[PDB]
Amino acid sequence: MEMEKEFEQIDKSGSWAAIYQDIRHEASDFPSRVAKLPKNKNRNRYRDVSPFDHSRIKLHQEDNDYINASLIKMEEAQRSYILTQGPLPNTVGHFWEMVWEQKSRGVVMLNRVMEKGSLKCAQYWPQKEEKEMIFEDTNLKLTLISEDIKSYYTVRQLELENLTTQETREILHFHYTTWPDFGVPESPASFLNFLFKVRESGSLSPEHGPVVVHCSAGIGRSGTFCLADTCLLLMDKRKDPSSVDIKKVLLEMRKFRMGLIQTADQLRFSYLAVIEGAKFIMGD
């Protein structure tokens, strides 16, 4: 079926939970043996969220190459994304090592450091220009260059230096600051505006390594971001945009990381975002 009318048909019939459970039943199951090794317990935020072995990002290190991060490679859309958990106190150095080694331009953050009165990820970037951060375990230095605070999101320019080689690179930090503590946003308008700002920066383009996207577990809000982006790109590429099937795209992405889209409310929000986004692209 088309999307917008499949949408109204699920709303009127109140069957979002049944649609979402079908997705969960059909989703791929692949091994994640490296994630479950005892030496990696303090590298995982949640015991039930792990990268598959076949698609995990490897650190360029001979001691321990493990990070909780996955490469989502979308062949028809010609887009790639790295989805990862919010960094932990003992993985902030690994996080920036990955950004460096994978040649990423942008980092997309969809959570606040504290939500619901608890810590959802480490404070992994500097908050003042004159107070830079050094990660001694991976030999990197990170400096805040500039910060632009808007009503729904903040953009930061950061400098990452590889202290071994003295090479430097500019990294863009895109921080969506207004996702509610419970549920999903009422309108997708600010989330779509944010997606378009990431796109306009070059961070999603083939001349760079894959964008790094995270929330707390790296599967819920993060899944919504890459699902909406890929569906809108396919609607631009194809002769028949109504052929884009958001459930099929989601199942394809779940071949590369488990659990993408965590609730039926997130599934409904993803439909809403793609539907509204397709009108703004045009032609309008």
Ligand SMILES: COC(=O)c1cccc(NS(C)(=O)=O)c1
């Ligand atoms: C404050 O940092 C920024 O907003 C910033 C800095 C440097 C470059 C960009 N790129 S763009 C595509 O959003 O125009 C943004």
